[PDB]
Design a protein around this nucleic acid. Structure first.
Lengths: 226, 215
RNA sequence: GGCACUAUGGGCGCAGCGUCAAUGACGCUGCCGGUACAGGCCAGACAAGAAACACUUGUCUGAUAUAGUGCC
């Protein structure tokens, strides 16, 4: 129960820049097991990166990182490291370090993994969102209900928080995953379905919060009529 | 050459009580150096099977591993509700190590057709010089869905982006959002902007459209 | 790769010197090439050590091997 691994030190870093992840062990002596780094791109799968071997310091790399990354351990500190160099837009991910088990107990299976650190690489500066209403109307009514929403447009970095009527409205909302625009910025929309007859009777406000740029935006969404 | 790990199915929709088998095939012999994982959204992976058939300590017995040469199938005898997640095979036969791309297991329910909504660009955004045209497909199952944008009947490519929700906690349906991006100028050069929605619950592809400058 | 044929500087002939090459091959002599037992040692294979490689320690293959050719 007492094995634990705590990554630390990830962040934003510009393309070509460098960043050193940490991997603190506790509950076991790090020296007698093989320690890995695995990465997982946003929305993608797990991608093995690196490993260093007990008693030998034998290190290994995946092709996509070879010659840039430098896996190491420091047994006086019970910690493993991942030095990352000439980082690329593709290197954006959450990084896990992992303990491969004891040979007789778990083969070469990875029996403990950290909770991951987030590594984001971009040339994009921080930029607060534009919010543009997605106005409800006909073309957005399917009988008793209407769809309406906000576009959170051209912000960096993740995440934003989107609430409706300062949190008072929650059911039937969908806030969508951010999508990365080829400009290096993110952009998402959030939609709410309401009973159509409430369009004249209940006001609706999207509350868009983007702490990195320290901007809070309320957009009243109003119907279009004719 | 690096060993290839390719999984099937890439996603699988099943219900509690189902016998589920995920298959995975290595590009060379990897003996039994194959590990399985369960990963749930936002959390870190959890080991299920090592040595391709050794049930990892503390993992419930409905999980089992199996091998025929380079064929590795992780099978769950009787699906339980906390099993809905992503699964991974891994070879640790040689460095570099290789993971499969992943099999997501989603909840099977009755076919539900999308409700389609479209939203023309704001007066506010158009003032900025950009026009984004948004199509929402609401509360459908299964996930598979064609969104096809037409501007004066011309099929659009490379100017739209899609986003999908995770299967809903309460009706186990999804929602998708395709946004068309245009320059303001590209927008005023045309009149009819349309969303074409093609889906299994629909008898034929449904379309929602508008005319630039409509009340 | 397997088979069949054929040949057989100790699995470790070197003073070695080169070369390719990043380390085994290759080449070049020169001695010695007699015979066998070696010791020792090395390499491959495997196993265990908190152990993918490396290491330690244990057995095992090193004419059941090695090589040229022929053949599918």
């Amino acid at each position: 129960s007492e094995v634990q691994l705590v990554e630390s030190g990830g962040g934003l870093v510009q393309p070509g820049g460098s960043l050193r992840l940490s991997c603190a062990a506790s509950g076991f002596y790090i020296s007698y097991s093989s320690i890995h780094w695995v990465r997982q791109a946003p929305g993608k799968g797990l991608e093995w990166v690196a490993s260093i071997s007990p008693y030998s310091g034998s290190t290994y790399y995946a092709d996509s990182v070879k010659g840039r990354f430098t896996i190491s351990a420091d047994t006086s500190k019970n910690t493993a490291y991942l030095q990352m160099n000439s980082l690329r837009a593709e290197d954006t991910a959450v990084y896990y370090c992992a303990r491969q088990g004891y040979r007789r107990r778990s083969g070469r299976g990875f029996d403990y993994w950290g909770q991951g650190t987030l590594v984001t690489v971009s040339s994009a500066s921080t930029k607060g969102p534009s919010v543009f209403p997605l106005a409800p109307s006909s073309k957005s009514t399917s009988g008793g209900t209407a769809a309406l929403g906000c576009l959170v447009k051209d912000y960096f970095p993740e995440p934003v928080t989107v609430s409706w009527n300062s949190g008072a409205l929650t059911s039937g909302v969908h806030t969508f995953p951010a999508v990365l625009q080829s400009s290096g910025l993110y952009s998402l929309s959030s939609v709410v379905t309401v009973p159509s007859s409430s369009l004249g009777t209940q006001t609706y406000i999207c509350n868009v919060n983007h702490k990195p740029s320290n901007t809070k935006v309320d957009k009243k969404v109003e119907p279009k009529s004719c | 050459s690096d060993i290839q790990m390719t999984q099937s199915p890439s996603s699988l929709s099943a219900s509690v009580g189902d016998r589920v088998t995920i298959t995975c095939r290595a590009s060379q012999s990897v003996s039994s150096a194959v590990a399985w994982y369960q990963q749930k959204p936002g959390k870190a992976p959890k080991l299920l099977i090592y040595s391709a058939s050794s049930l990892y300590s503390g993992v419930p017995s409905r999980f089992s591993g199996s091998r025929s040469g380079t064929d590795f199938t992780l099978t769950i005898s009787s699906l339980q509700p906390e099993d809905f997640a992503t699964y991974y095979c891994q070879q640790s036969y040689s460095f570099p190590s290789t993971f499969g791309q992943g099999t997501k297991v989603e909840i099977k329910r009755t076919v539900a057709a999308p409700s389609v909504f479209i939203f023309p660009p704001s007066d506010e955004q158009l003032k900025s010089g950009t026009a984004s045209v948004v199509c929402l497909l609401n509360n459908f199952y299964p996930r598979e869905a064609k969104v096809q944008w037409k501007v004066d009947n011309a099929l659009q490519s490379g100017n739209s982006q899609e986003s999908v929700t995770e299967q809903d906690s309460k009706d186990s349906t999804y929602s998708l959002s395709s946004t068309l991006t245009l320059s303001k100028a590209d927008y005023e050069k045309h009149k009819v902007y349309a969303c074409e929605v093609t889906h299994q619950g629909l008898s034929s592809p449904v379309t929602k459209s508008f005319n630039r400058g409509e009340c």
